[PDB]
Design a protein around this nucleic acid. Structure first.
Lengths: 772, 696, 158, 51, 50
RNA sequence: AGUAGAAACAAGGGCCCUG
């Protein structure tokens, strides 16, 4: 308004100058950032000192002037000063004041209508508070603690994201008008943005603060700390009040934040799909990628794509590793040999060949590494630090707390180093059948011995006996381990050291881009294997909740419900741009051409034949009522259209619309066959399966341009087309062109025509056509 | 991040990434070009779009991703089969419905230069399409399919946004054909220098580069030089057991006198009851003035010791007068000007206005810094240390905040222990000195901030609370305001930190002085005071302060933190070794050595030994200087050697004599260093009866 | 969205003086306060505002030719006397889904002598004893209540 | 327990309450049945018992 | 303060879903599962803040 | 006078201002 005119006058006055003009004309807009630094640069050494030296003055604070006049803030209220007319040297538009002014505002100043929005701004800390209040403390005890150091997360957070996915989110919620082009993360996560926008919209707020708080709401604070007991973010946030080196405040904190359940579910799904793809013999790679992209799962309220969560988590498991490798996702330098965990500290080496005779004379190649290396190892409640040297376990130290875990870790370590005579002459018990190739897929003798150990405890005892046994020398009695795993004995194993106190887990902020083979074995720029499919449990049955396996092989439904779902999918795919589609017809109010679509003609056979006419009447009625006015709900037409193919008739409509398989849908209420919500208006749930509706048109519910972006696209720039806003963008015609402003310092030309395909297929195919 | 490949993987498919990587590896070019190539390749892919011909067959064929030789082989194969002319150069894609190759280009500059160069290079032989990241297109034929254009422009827009966000949207990562050679603009002067800073045997950076890039390891010469250097050195190794530590040689001379601004043991104070209404200093200084005792004082012109007594007497009279005027202000006279150094600063003389005759007139040599002079061991320090251990007849000397609520056993334990310790410590004498310093320094800082360029009057006071007797008698004990003396500032124009503003101290005492200790003071005989009647003395001196000492003295509550840390640590360690609450027992039973009496050792429970550590920390806060810093920094070696001796660890060293020298170098006219050094000598002596590595 | 934009959209260049119907369902109004309404709307005879986070009726201007209103799904409570001040020619009213506790809040509606039908469903008042009868004794001119007249006479379609 | 009636602070003190989406109510309409959607509440409470 | 509700269940503020009774599934473990099949319970998703 | 350290202060800018 008048303010706008004032801004224009100021811009004019400023352009009248020469230097300001040169700087606002030369270069791009990014220069602003630079200019933001050359100004207001001043620091101090000991702010505490200067704070006591300033607050000892009369007017140590600055403040706005017009805000005080408008607020009717007086001066010398009760013989105590609050401010005096002056001009700070830097701002030139602020006036000195005193701290008393801050109380005078707090006690008899202007009051806002409501302020509960704060609870949303700082949701993380109110969550901290609530989690604290729901704890049941317990007694206090004194003792020594085995605090192990390690990298963990201290802030419980749902839907952990990256930084590039946030710099955009901070715009579509707060400063939308200057929003950039729509990124994929937005089009995919629409309901999330809508939720974050419903709260911080049409509100008086400082937006920078909100953006900072959102960054904190989506940042898991990772720290390298000493830790004891279970590992959960709910505890690490207050670890300071649970136990130290000499004391422990017992308290139960198990039933809060429901975090690890999501991770175990994710890992179970990963295991399932990995096994599925392993069932194949020549395309397990593409099979696995398809199973991935053809799957989704729910998180709290929203539905997220699997491949999106996998690239955000940090669970170092032999399952997640494979998936993150298929999707080209980089990861850390962490190994995995069965259930145990490993990490290399130093050393090097290279593969080498050797053979062993299984029974009598049966040569079988097995490899090892020819050099010295040092490794940290972590099994359940047990740690170890060992070294391998030319097919031998040089030394090892342990700091666990259990005998069984301490024996299993030792055995798996011995195996990992190919130490012992068994690798030189295997036992009679093993045979060529147990060797490898369940159905053709070979198995190195390593995992063979692994399962041979997991089979019987006596195999483990014999393997341990393979390690040298001697008499416990004096003094070393405490640092010794028997065969049962006892801290001391009269005779103990060879080259072993024990101690109380776990080992400090190493750390490295490194990343590597690895690959894998057709047999599901990952490699890292070397002959070393980081993961495989033999290191996971054999198999297990689970009933996954709030998941979507939209893939034929990964499906249990019959041809009937599957046909219904595919018909709905096909009917939705016609929701794009271009004539002959439902949006253009609605705009033209051609409610009749919908009845003659081919998709309804393909779904008609599924309709109950004895009452198809009556239902048809009702459907057509509803459609006209919604279409004639313009107040329609896109989630109801897509439901009732399949019935409008036949001719109306007469009869009593009970209230339900049945198919030929005794499954119905009701027009207005959600059921198992067709459900949806105003929260997430971009999803359709049929028989549990989820379907993503494109965003081409927006009904009464959808209330922004976000619902139109999948209908627009970029095209060659045309200066003839008009320039418009982001709100009038809905009044364009399908197939038209229009210029527009995007983000900042950028203008482009858009066209309301969509592109069905994505790059995943157009590159891979053309590539495979080159290896011939 | 951390590599261009991971970056490209952000908005590209890893397949094309690997392709362009293998390509650059083939040509062995800088991997910063992974991006452009991948982009071009992906465009080609999305340009095919799996379109088909009338015969249900693929329409477009891709050749860019293939090797160069294979690509040319296929090019010639197609030029032959379909009977087309062979092209001189290679292309990217070929179509069948038209039977003519097609070349794709890309650029960032919004100009036709790239398309003009390409069209000149290839004329009109085949179809060329150059897109722009900012929505432009230049070609030599009919436009491509619509979907292709849409799909290409959208991808390019996303990529350009990402790059601009990563600051890589420049010629470096997106160059044209020509601007593909980036290099540091090596000038002339820089080279002239580089060829001059080379080590001696070489004379040009080229020789050094050739010697380093081809350097091979010769372990034998290395070992030979190692041994040679190992023979001409003869590094001494000295096991302490054989080479023991002598005692420390303290300096010699007069005794180190009192240095603290305020008196602690010799201080006398007048007390009254505190009213909440009148709580400021400028008010209490008048309240104490009305009753007449502050005015009953009337010293005489004959001092027991000191100098400039006339100035001090006149200043005291002016102080009394100003107090009577209800204005804590003083006028600028000759006396105050002298005892304030108001005109002492030197008058500058520029050199441009200087000459030899002026110098010869009045010698203007370089200032001869007069470093401090040595001192001797003070014999009055133990007296103050023992006096600062006893109660003071009151408590609450140091203000403290309140205790918050509690919900778990942890906070209960903490509050209980903290209450015990605070109640034990708040009753001592060192505590009242801490509170005195706190409040007086706060008042002085406020005044220096508000009333500079003006001589003021500030009291030396404190606030406390009489102890709590049984319920019998008068319950709810009252509070008390105590006054030990008067203070005065002088134009604290603190233009800069570390500055100095002279002050003056008028204190009350009932104990005659000593020449060695109370050397700087100038005492007067004032009169008599009650308790019966006893004589009265007036200790007077001069000193200065600064912002830093003010801020730190005001923050003198850290000693509590340190002491609590030590005590709680000891108690928790003793309690954990037995897995039981052993805190009260450890405080009432565990004995700690304190000192010697009659040649024997003395001990008392920790509950009473806390006071020693508290006084130690307070003195560290008071007498802190560079000397004490260096001393306390160089004494750790001795303690570590002692610990090694206790555990039979055969310690050793390279040159202990130098360590003793460094230590004894920083012992000058600072009482705390001398006292602690003598005590360290006594420590090593007492331990020699139980340990080695020390000489007598 | 916002009642302002919704209205400006519904007004496809049409003056706010020749319309006979309007709808604003599934919208939002800041502070639960009307925004964009004026006395310009004279020929309007129907209105529909549903699920718009409404809580009161204070900015509602004077509409005489109006004879039917809908305020369901909101949380209005207390303000029911303006109807006499602004719409005294009203006949059909609906409030199901709003915050209504007692009958004293309903008493003002007696002055709407032109009132015929009322709709109260899912409100607390309905959970009382002898409420239909007591209401009828309060509002005699009324005939239909939630679609049913005395003796439970189902009302016709329209 | 399920309910379609928001609570009052006095009578409902031992109860923790939530809001669980919506539901439907069914009533006669001439010679047919209809359905009118309403909200839905969830009443949570703890208590003991004995034999 | 006023005396609050004490009984275990709810009398007046209650609500109930319905279904047809099968004599072959007339047990709690079966009735609950059947009620759950149609998915009206799974739709019950209480929000965080009460 | 004094302070403190291993050099600096003991006002500085224009009769007026200021940390």
């Amino acid at each position: 308004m008048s303010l706008l005119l004032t801004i224009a006058k100021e811009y004019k006055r400023l352009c009248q100058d020469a230097k300001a003009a040169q700087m606002m004309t030369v270069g791009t807009v990014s220069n602003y950032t630079t200019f933001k630094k050359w100004t207001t640069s001043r620091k101090e050494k000991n702010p505490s000192l200067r704070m006591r030296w300033a607050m000892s003055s009369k007017f140590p604070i600055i403040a706005n002037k017009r805000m005080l006049e408008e607020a009717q803030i007086p001066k010398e209220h009760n013989n105590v000063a609050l401010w005096e007319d002056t001009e700070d040297v830097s701002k030139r538009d602020h006036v000195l004041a005193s701290a008393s002014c801050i109380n005078y505002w707090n006690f008899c100043g202007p009051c806002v209508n409501n302020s509960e929005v704060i609870k949303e701004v700082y949701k993380s800390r109110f969550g901290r508070l609530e989690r604290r209040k729901e704890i049941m403390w317990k007694e206090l005890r004194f003792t020594l603690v085995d605090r192990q150091r390690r990298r963990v997360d201290t802030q419980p957070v749902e839907q952990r994201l990256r930084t590039g996915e946030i710099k955009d989110l901070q715009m579509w919620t707060l400063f939308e008008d200057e929003a950039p082009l729509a990124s994929k993360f937005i089009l995919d996560n629409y309901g999330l943005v809508k939720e974050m926008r419903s709260k911080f919209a049409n509100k008086p707020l400082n937006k920078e603060v909100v953006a900072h708080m959102l960054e904190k709401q989506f940042n898991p604070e990772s720290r390298f700390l000493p830790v004891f007991g279970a590992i959960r973010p709910e505890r690490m946030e207050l670890i300071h009040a649970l136990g130290g080196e000499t004391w422990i405040q017992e308290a139960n904190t198990a039933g809060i934040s429901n975090v690890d359940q999501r991770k175990n579910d994710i890992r179970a799904v990963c295991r399932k799909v990995c096994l599925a793809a392993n069932a194949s013999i020549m395309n397990a790679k593409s099979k696995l990628v398809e199973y991935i992209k053809s799957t989704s799962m729910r998180i709290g309220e929203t539905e997220r794509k699997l491949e999106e969560l996998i690239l955000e988590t940090d669970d170092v498991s032999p399952e997640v590793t494979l998936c993150k490798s298929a999707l080209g996702g980089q990861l850390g330098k962490t190994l995995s040999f069965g259930p145990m965990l490993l990490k290399k500290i130093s050393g090097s080496g290279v593969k080498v060949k050797d053979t062993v005779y299984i029974q009598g004379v049966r040569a079988v190649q097995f490899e090892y590494w020819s050099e010295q290396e040092e490794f940290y190892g972590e099994y359940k409640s047990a740690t170890a630090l060992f070294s391998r040297k030319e097919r031998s376990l040089e030394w090892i130290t342990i700091g666990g707390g259990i005998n069984e875990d301490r024996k299993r870790l030792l055995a798996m370590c011995m195996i990992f180093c190919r130490d012992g005579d068994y690798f030189k002459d295997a036992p009679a018990t093993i045979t060529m059948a147990d060797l490898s190739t369940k159905l053709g897929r070979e198995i190195p003798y390593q995992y063979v011995m692994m399962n041979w150990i997991q089979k019987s405890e006596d195999n483990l005892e014999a393997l341990l006996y393979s390690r040298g046994i001697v008499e416990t020398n004096p003094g070393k009695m405490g640092s010794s381990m028997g065969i049962d795993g006892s801290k001391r004995a009269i005779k103990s194993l060879r080259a072993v050291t024990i101690q109380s106190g776990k080992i400090d887990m190493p750390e490295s902020k490194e990343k590597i881009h690895l690959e894998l083979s057709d047999n599901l074995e990952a490699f890292d720029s070397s002959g070393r294997i980081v993961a495989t499919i033999l290191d996971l449990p054999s198999d297990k049955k689970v009933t996954f909740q709030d998941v979507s396996f939209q893939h034929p092989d990964l499906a249990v439904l019959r041809d009937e419900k599957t046909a219904i779902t595919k018909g709905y999918e096909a009917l939705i795919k016609r929701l794009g741009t271009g004539d002959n589609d439902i949006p253009s017809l609605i705009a033209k109010k051609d409610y009749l051409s919908l009845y003659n679509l081919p998709e309804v003609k393909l779904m008609a056979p599924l309709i109950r034949p004895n009452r198809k006419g009556v239902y048809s009447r009702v459907a057509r009625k509803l459609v006209s009522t919604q279409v004639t006015t313009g107040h329609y709900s896109l989630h109801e037409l897509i439901k009732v259209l399949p019935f409008t193919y036949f001719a109306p008739k007469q009869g009593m409509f009970e209230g339900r619309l049945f198919f030929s398989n005794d499954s119905f849908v009701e027009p207005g209420v959600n059921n198992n066959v067709f459900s949806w919500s105003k929260a997430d208006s971009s999803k359709i749930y049929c028989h549990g399966i989820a379907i993503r509706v494109p965003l081409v048109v927006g009904d009464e519910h959808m209330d922004t341009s976000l619902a139109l972006l999948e209908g627009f696209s970029v095209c060659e720039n045309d200066p003839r087309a008009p320039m418009v806003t982001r709100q009038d963008l809905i009044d364009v015609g399908f197939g038209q062109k229009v210029r527009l402003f995007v983000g900042q310092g950028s203008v482009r030309t858009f066209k309301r025509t969509a592109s069905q395909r994505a790059a995943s297929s157009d590159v891979n195919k053309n590539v495979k056509k080159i290896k011939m | 991040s951390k590599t261009f490949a991971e970056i490209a993987e952000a908005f590209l498919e890893p397949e094309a990434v690997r392709i362009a990587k293998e390509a650059v590896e083939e040509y062995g070019d800088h991997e910063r070009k992974i991006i452009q190539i991948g982009i071009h390749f992906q465009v080609c892919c999305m340009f095919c779009d799996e379109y088909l011909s009338t015969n249900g067959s693929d329409r477009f064929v891709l050749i860019e991703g293939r090797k160069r030789g294979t690509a040319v082989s296929l090019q010639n194969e197609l030029c032959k089969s379909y009977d087309l002319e062979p092209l001189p150069f290679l292309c990217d894609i070929f179509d069948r419905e038209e039977k003519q190759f097609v070349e794709i280009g890309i650029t960032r500059k919004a100009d036709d230069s790239y398309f003009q160069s390409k069209f000149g290079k290839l004329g009109n032989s085949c179809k060329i399409f150059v897109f722009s990241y900012d929505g432009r297109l230049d070609k030599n034929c009919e436009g491509p399919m619509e979907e292709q254009k849409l799909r290409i422009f959208s991808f390019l827009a996303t990529a350009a946004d990402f790059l601009r966000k990563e600051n890589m949207f420049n010629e470096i990562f997106l160059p044209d054909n020509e601007e593909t050679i980036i290099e540091m603009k090596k000038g002339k002067t820089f080279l002239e220098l580089r060829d001059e800073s080379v080590p001696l045997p070489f004379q040009t950076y080229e020789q050094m580069k050739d010697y380093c890039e081809k350097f091979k390891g010769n372990p034998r010469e290395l070992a030979s030089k190692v041994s040679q250097m190992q023979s001409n050195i003869k590094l001494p190794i000295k096991h302490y057991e054989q080479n023991k530590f002598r005692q420390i040689r303290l300096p010699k001379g007069p005794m180190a006198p009192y240095t603290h601004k305020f008196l602690m043991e010799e201080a006398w104070m007048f007390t009254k009851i505190s009213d909440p209404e009148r709580s400021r200093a400028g008010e209490i200084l008048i309240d104490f003035f009305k009753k007449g005792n502050l005015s009953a004082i009337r010293p005489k012109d004959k001092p027991l010791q000191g100098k400039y007594p006339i100035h001090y007497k006149n200043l005291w009279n002016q102080i009394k007068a100003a107090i009577a005027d209800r204005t804590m202000v003083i006028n600028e006279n000759d006396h105050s000007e002298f005892l304030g150094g108001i005109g002492r600063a030197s008058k500058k003389i520029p050199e441009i206005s200087l000459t030899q005759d002026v110098i010869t007139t009045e010698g203007l040599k370089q200032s001869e810094n007069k470093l401090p002079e040595p001192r001797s061991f003070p014999r009055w320090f133990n007296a103050e240390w023992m006096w600062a251990i006893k109660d003071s007849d009151l408590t609450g000397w140091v203000p403290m905040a309140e205790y918050p609520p509690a919900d778990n056993e942890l906070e209960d334990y903490a509050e209980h222990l903290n209450k015990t310790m605070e109640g034990v410590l708040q009753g001592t004498n060192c505590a009242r000195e801490m509170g005195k310093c706190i409040l007086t320094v706060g008042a002085l800082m406020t005044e220096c901030r508000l009333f500079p360029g003006k001589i003021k009057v500030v009291p030396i006071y404190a606030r406390s609370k009489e102890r709590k007797s049984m319920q019998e008698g008068l319950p709810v004990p009252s509070e008390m305001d105590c006054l030990f003396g008067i203070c005065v500032k002088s134009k604290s124009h603190l233009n800069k930190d570390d500055g100095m503003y002279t002050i003056i101290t008028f204190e009350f005492s009932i104990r005659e002085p000593n020449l060695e200790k109370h050397q700087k003071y100038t005492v007067f005989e004032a009169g008599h005071t009650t308790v019966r009647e006893v004589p009265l003395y007036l200790y007077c001196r001069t000193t200065a302060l600064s912002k830093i000492k003010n801020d730190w003295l005001s923050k003198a509550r850290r000693c509590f933190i340190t002491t609590m840390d030590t005590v709680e640590t000891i108690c928790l360690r003793e309690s954990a070794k037995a897995e039981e609450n052993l805190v009260e027992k450890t405080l009432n039973e565990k004995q700690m050595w304190i000192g010697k009496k009659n040649g024997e050792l003395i001990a008392q429970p920790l509950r009473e030994a806390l006071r020693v550590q508290l006084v130690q920390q307070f003195y560290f806060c008071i007498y802190n200087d560079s000397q004490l810093e260096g001393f306390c920094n160089e004494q750790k070696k001795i303690l570590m050697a002692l610990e090694g001796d206790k555990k039979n660890k055969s310690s050793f060293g390279f040159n202990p004599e130098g360590l003793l020298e460094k230590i004894e170098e920083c012992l000058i006219n600072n009482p705390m260093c001398l006292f602690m050094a003598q005590r360290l000598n006594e420590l090593v002596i007492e331990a020699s009866k139980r340990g080695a590595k020390f000489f007598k | 969205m916002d009642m302002k934009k919704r209205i400006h959209l519904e007004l496809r260049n049409r003056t706010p003086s020749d319309v006979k119907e309007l709808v604003l369902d599934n919208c939002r109004s800041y502070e639960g306060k009307i925004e964009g309404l004026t006395d310009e709307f004279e020929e309007l005879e129907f209105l529909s505002t549903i699920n718009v986070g409404l809580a009161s009726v204070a900015n509602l201007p004077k509409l005489n030719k109006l004879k039917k209103l809908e305020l369901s799904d909101n949380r209005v409570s207390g303000g029911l006397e303006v109807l006499a001040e602004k719409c005294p020619n009203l006949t059909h009213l609906n409030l199901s889904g709003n915050k209504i506790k007692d009958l004293g809040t309903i008493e003002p509606l007696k002055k709407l002598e032109n009132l015929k039908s009322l709709d109260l469903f899912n409100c607390e008042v309905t959970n009382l004893n002898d409420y239909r009868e007591n209401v009828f004794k309060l509002l005699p001119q009324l005939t239909y209540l939630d679609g049913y007249d005395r003796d439970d006479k189902e009302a016709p379609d329209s | 327990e399920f309910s379609i009636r928001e609570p009052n602070l006095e009578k409902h003190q031992k109860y923790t309450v939530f809001e669980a989406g919506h539901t439907t109510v069914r009533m006669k309409k001439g010679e047919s049945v209809i359905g009118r959607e309403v909200p839905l509440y969830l009443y949570c409470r703890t208590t003991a018992l004995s034999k």
